[PDB]
Design a protein around this ligand. Sequence first.
Ligand SMILES: [Zn+2]
Length: 45
Amino acid sequence: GSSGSSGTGQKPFECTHCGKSFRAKGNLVTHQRIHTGEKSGPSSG
Ligand SMILES: [Zn+2]
């Protein structure tokens, strides 16, 4: 139940796929990995 704050303007890195914006490329890149079909999954927690 987050406040619901969206629409900041235009970020240097956006996930056109869904619309997830980020500050740096990496941050976003890691997010996009959620869309990609392939799955690698981590090792441990
Ligand atoms: Zn996305």
